[PDB]
Enzyme design. Structure first.
Site, PDB file in Angstrom:
ATOM      1  N   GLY A 177       2.980   5.660  10.338  1.00 19.16           N
ATOM      2  CA  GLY A 177       4.283   5.490   9.743  1.00 19.16           C
ATOM      3  C   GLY A 177       4.992   4.201  10.123  1.00 19.16           C
ATOM      4  O   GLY A 177       6.098   3.972   9.641  1.00 19.16           O
ATOM      5  N   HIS A 205       0.801  -1.222   0.000  1.00 19.60           N
ATOM      6  CA  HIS A 205       0.000   0.000   0.000  1.00 19.60           C
ATOM      7  C   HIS A 205       0.834   1.271   0.000  1.00 19.60           C
ATOM      8  O   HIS A 205       0.279   2.377  -0.051  1.00 19.60           O
ATOM      9  CB  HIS A 205      -1.012  -0.008   1.162  1.00 19.60           C
ATOM     10  CG  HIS A 205      -0.452   0.198   2.537  1.00 19.60           C
ATOM     11  ND1 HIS A 205      -0.297  -0.844   3.417  1.00 19.60           N
ATOM     12  CD2 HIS A 205      -0.141   1.322   3.229  1.00 19.60           C
ATOM     13  CE1 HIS A 205       0.117  -0.380   4.585  1.00 19.60           C
ATOM     14  NE2 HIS A 205       0.240   0.932   4.491  1.00 19.60           N
ATOM     15  N   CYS A 259       4.094   1.047   9.397  1.00 13.50           N
ATOM     16  CA  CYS A 259       3.928  -0.079   8.494  1.00 13.50           C
ATOM     17  C   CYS A 259       5.244  -0.436   7.836  1.00 13.50           C
ATOM     18  O   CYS A 259       6.087   0.429   7.551  1.00 13.50           O
ATOM     19  CB  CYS A 259       2.909   0.237   7.403  1.00 13.50           C
ATOM     20  SG  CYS A 259       1.227   0.183   8.022  1.00 13.50           S
TER      21      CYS A 259
HETATM   22  C1  LIG Z   1       1.011   1.885   8.566  1.00 13.86           C
HETATM   23  N1  LIG Z   1       1.888   2.808   8.518  1.00 13.86           N
HETATM   24  C2  LIG Z   1      -0.338   2.154   9.342  1.00 13.86           C
HETATM   25  C3  LIG Z   1      -0.206   1.723  10.807  1.00 13.86           C
HETATM   26  C4  LIG Z   1      -1.441   2.067  11.726  1.00 13.86           C
HETATM   27  C5  LIG Z   1      -1.446   3.569  11.900  1.00 13.86           C
HETATM   28  C6  LIG Z   1      -1.809   3.866  13.342  1.00 13.86           C
HETATM   29  N2  LIG Z   1      -1.415   2.693  14.152  1.00 13.86           N
HETATM   30  C7  LIG Z   1      -1.225   1.650  13.243  1.00 13.86           C
HETATM   31  O1  LIG Z   1      -0.862   0.524  13.470  1.00 13.86           O
HETATM   32  N3  LIG Z   1      -1.386   1.356   8.641  1.00 13.86           N
HETATM   33  C8  LIG Z   1      -2.632   1.971   8.173  1.00 13.86           C
HETATM   34  O2  LIG Z   1      -2.905   3.131   8.402  1.00 13.86           O
HETATM   35  C9  LIG Z   1      -3.600   1.045   7.399  1.00 13.86           C
HETATM   36  C10 LIG Z   1      -3.350   1.159   5.873  1.00 13.86           C
HETATM   37  C11 LIG Z   1      -4.370   0.300   5.024  1.00 13.86           C
HETATM   38  C12 LIG Z   1      -4.109   0.449   3.485  1.00 13.86           C
HETATM   39  C13 LIG Z   1      -4.418  -1.186   5.513  1.00 13.86           C
HETATM   40  N4  LIG Z   1      -5.030   1.383   7.713  1.00 13.86           N
HETATM   41  C14 LIG Z   1      -5.590   1.055   8.977  1.00 13.86           C
HETATM   42  O3  LIG Z   1      -4.985   0.373   9.791  1.00 13.86           O
HETATM   43  O4  LIG Z   1      -6.884   1.466   9.316  1.00 13.86           O
HETATM   44  C15 LIG Z   1      -7.712   0.657  10.167  1.00 13.86           C
HETATM   45  C16 LIG Z   1      -9.023   0.056   9.463  1.00 13.86           C
HETATM   46  C17 LIG Z   1      -8.709  -1.109   8.457  1.00 13.86           C
HETATM   47  C18 LIG Z   1      -9.773   1.209   8.816  1.00 13.86           C
HETATM   48  S1  LIG Z   1     -10.065  -0.628  10.919  1.00 13.86           S
HETATM   49  C19 LIG Z   1     -10.490   0.792  12.057  1.00 13.86           C
HETATM   50  C20 LIG Z   1     -11.714   1.471  11.883  1.00 13.86           C
HETATM   51  C21 LIG Z   1     -12.031   2.552  12.737  1.00 13.86           C
HETATM   52  C22 LIG Z   1     -11.141   2.960  13.753  1.00 13.86           C
HETATM   53  C23 LIG Z   1      -9.917   2.282  13.917  1.00 13.86           C
HETATM   54  C24 LIG Z   1      -9.594   1.201  13.065  1.00 13.86           C
END
Ligand SMILES: *C(=N)[C@H](C[C@@H]1CCNC1=O)NC(=O)[C@H](CC(C)C)NC(=O)OCC(C)(C)Sc1ccccc1
Ligand SMILES: *C(=N)[C@H](C[C@@H]1CCNC1=O)NC(=O)[C@H](CC(C)C)NC(=O)OCC(C)(C)Sc1ccccc1
EC number: 3.4.19.12
Lengths: 300, 301
Positions: free
Chosen positions: B143, B41, B145
């Site tokens: 950040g 991603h 990931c």
């Molecule tokens: C990578 N850099 C981040 C790590 C996240 C950010 C905050 N703490 C973490 O571990 N990954 C993301 O932001 C991912 C990216 C997508 C493309 C998978 N998105 C994400 O984790 O969002 C959570 C969901 C899938 C939307 S579930 C949720 C819904 C409502 C409130 C909290 C979580």
């Protein structure tokens, strides 16, 4: 989320070596052209009961010390003693030496431990210097010379070198000047520590961490004065909270909107009522080995 | 208790962390030999993440759109491909700090060390357990990931986890290094949730063995059970059933203590059915489930 997090240990791993004298092997810390290690490496089992270290050391020669960095022997070209630490001068400098300083930490402060055996790093974990100057570590035979440290920017501040276990299973050691934390001595005797107390400013930081992560069952609508809180804290063998502690907790207070003395009223209720079977951040006990800085760094 | 979560020394992994940027999106990558591995991603804009078409986004990408940096030193990309939810970027420099390594897919209950990283710079290391619902209880910020989880066996780093997401309950989800998610999660910015979690029985048993090793053995009884009878009872207390591999990995602790695995299962069943009755084990009224049998051996022996 919230975990006990250690500093990345690679800068310290590149400094760990094995030091052997006679049939005694432990770890040393190789910075520039000097290897630091616990001086009791020079003792026999007979010597350990009551060692006259200056007398034992003058009877040693440079070639009695075997230093190994992996598969390579380092030649010892000089040696001196600084309190409970031996300094072995070697003929080659460590190119992996980080920027570093030696610091003496205060009780309540936290640090990472790199546990090593035979000069090889084994594990890394976070510790606090207890108020009674022990640390609750995980150390086995051959762990002496393992070090504790913090990292700031790219600077490694070494604060602990491991020397001993006490009958209660807690640990004692020195700073990198070879001075013990606490009333302990590097002789092979059973030694007790002073009565330990709980690090109050750290418990408060951890309660603020539990709020940040959505755990609020322990909060209440009440407040307390600083002195009335400290009276209860001391009754329960908690350290007093100073105004500097309150100041240090500001950012966590601002971030969560819970005033420090309001959180003190929450902790007071927990000390008097217990947790009644509940848990906070997974723990059945109040956790006191996160500093305010530890929580801030990890939660923001 | 005498036990604590201990991570592996992180240096061999620190030497493999880089940052990967597409546009303004920067995450972490893992540099081994001449390949950089990272979450796919990274090729998404924040708006693409709401509903990405990864194959279409990628076909529009060229090698020269990827900024890979070790520190502030650029590592030129000479090839790119997608493997499940991981991007593989071939680079023109073999990492001189590449350790001996393997890619492994772990099972629920297994523990590993996470090196939390931001902009390719390590921040902290901690121990995690893979939950039966295929989440981990990590500590991750924006950040993070591309941060990886690993075990170290002798001098060989077994990479098992790459970080992708945080769920509403505050737990974390990710892939193995072949890009296959643990659990039923997908890399899309769409509402997702962790399944109901359960207690890691094999690890609780490891904890009871650890207690015995330390002389705390009031809970041992004269009875035994079959594996199937135990599993059916365990599930009623929201404990995981044991697998044959679980019985096998408790072998060393069973040998060390002389307590058969199924006898320890019978002792656990009695704790589940009767409670502790105010007693403690290793100083706690709670049964710990994030120390594996290997972890217990590490810290006792
Ligand atoms: C990578 N850099 C981040 C790590 C996240 C950010 C905050 N703490 C973490 O571990 N990954 C993301 O932001 C991912 C990216 C997508 C493309 C998978 N998105 C994400 O984790 O969002 C959570 C969901 C899938 C939307 S579930 C949720 C819904 C409502 C409130 C909290 C979580
Ligand atoms: C350094 N390599 C070891 C590290 C110790 C070993 C076990 N866990 C540890 O942290 N340091 C020592 O063995 C030191 C050496 C002396 C000269 C300072 N001695 C020591 O730690 O002894 C522990 C005791 C005194 C044996 S505790 C005990 C007393 C009575 C009955 C049972 C246990």
């Amino acid at each position: 989320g919230f975990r006990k997090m250690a500093f990345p240990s690679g800068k310290v791993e590149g400094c760990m070596v094995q030091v052997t004298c006679g049939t005694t092997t432990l770890n040393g810390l190789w910075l520039d052209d000097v290897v630091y290690c616990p001086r009791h490496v020079i003792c026999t089992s007979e010597d350990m009961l009551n060692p006259n270290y200056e007398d034992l050391l003058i009877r040693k020669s440079n070639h009695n010390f075997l230093v190994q960095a992996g598969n390579v022997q380092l030649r010892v070209i000089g040696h001196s003693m600084q309190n409970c630490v031996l300094k072995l001068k070697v003929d080659t400098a460590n190119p992996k030496t980080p920027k570093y300083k030696f610091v003496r930490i205060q009780p309540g402060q936290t640090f990472s431990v790199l546990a090593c055996y035979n000069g090889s790093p084994s594990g890394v974990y976070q510790c606090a210097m207890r108020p009674n100057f022990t640390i609750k570590g995980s150390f086995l035979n051959g762990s002496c010379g393992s070090v504790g440290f913090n990292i700031d920017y790219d600077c490694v501040s070494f604060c602990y070198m491991h020397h001993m276990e006490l009958p209660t299973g807690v640990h004692a050691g020195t700073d990198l000047e070879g001075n013990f934390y606490g009333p302990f001595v590097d002789r092979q005797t059973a030694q007790a520590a002073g009565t330990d107390t709980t690090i109050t400013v750290n418990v408060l930081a951890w309660l603020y961490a539990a709020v940040i992560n959505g755990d609020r069952w322990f909060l209440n609508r009440f407040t307390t004065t600083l002195n009335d809180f400290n009276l209860v804290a001391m009754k329960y063998n908690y350290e007093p909270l100073t105004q500097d502690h309150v100041d240090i907790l500001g950012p966590l207070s601002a971030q969560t909107g819970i005033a420090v003395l309001d959180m003190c009223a929450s902790l007071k209720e927990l000390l008097q009522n217990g947790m009644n079977g509940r848990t906070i951040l997974g723990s059945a006990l109040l956790e006191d080995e996160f500093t305010p800085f530890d929580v801030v760094r990890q939660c923001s």
